[PDB]
Amino acid sequence: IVNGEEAVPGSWPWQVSLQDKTGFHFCGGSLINENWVVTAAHCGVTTSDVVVAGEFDQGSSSEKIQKLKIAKVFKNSKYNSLTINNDITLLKLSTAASFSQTVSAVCLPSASDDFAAGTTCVTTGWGLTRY
Amino acid sequence: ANTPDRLQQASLPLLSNTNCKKYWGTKIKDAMICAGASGVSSCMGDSGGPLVCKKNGAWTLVGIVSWGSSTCSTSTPGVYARVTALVNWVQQTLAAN
């Protein structure tokens, strides 16, 4: 996020970090339940990757996070690598996340729902804050 | 780097697809929703994270960070996968596994 601001630790409890086998963040995700994480198809997540829940300051030596293993990756079959259309993958976790103060789910909208243009919304992440 | 240690946040406006095509043209498909162009930009490493709007007191997933300006330009809207358009597949999938 360019021109964002540091969130309060634990204020976005559904936010997870998808890390490779060697511990490097490569994409974000959201817990929608204790056993499933939704992310983008383009992130090309594998069962080798790990989901870090409850994290705030990645630069830590530790805080009370959870490293969850991925049992199966469900990439949308309509995902089009060319147009980046239908860009969603679901991750089924090997072991369920333990909900707490700092780890809980985001709600899913109904397909019928409308979010009007002009509405202020929020985005979160550990992306670069400068290009 | 420019790659933060601490989680960052930003609030930003949703755009209509019609206004979003004013920036991205035909690259904008039914399953995408745009937001931003307001002085903030999602950038490298934010991909797959949430775009949430309050819905009855509760934060709801409206978009997933997908793509944006190759320079992380704060005057161009970011593009998010439109959850409302993919939620039947989400539910069908959960129900089957």
């Binding site: 630790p9 634990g10 204020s11 809980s104 709600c107 929020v122 | 509760a58």
Partner: peptide, 10 residues
């Protein structure tokens, strides 16, 4: 879902 125990400050 969607109500953090820790409230965000935006």
């Amino acid at each position: 879902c969607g109500v953090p125990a820790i409230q965000p400050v935006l």
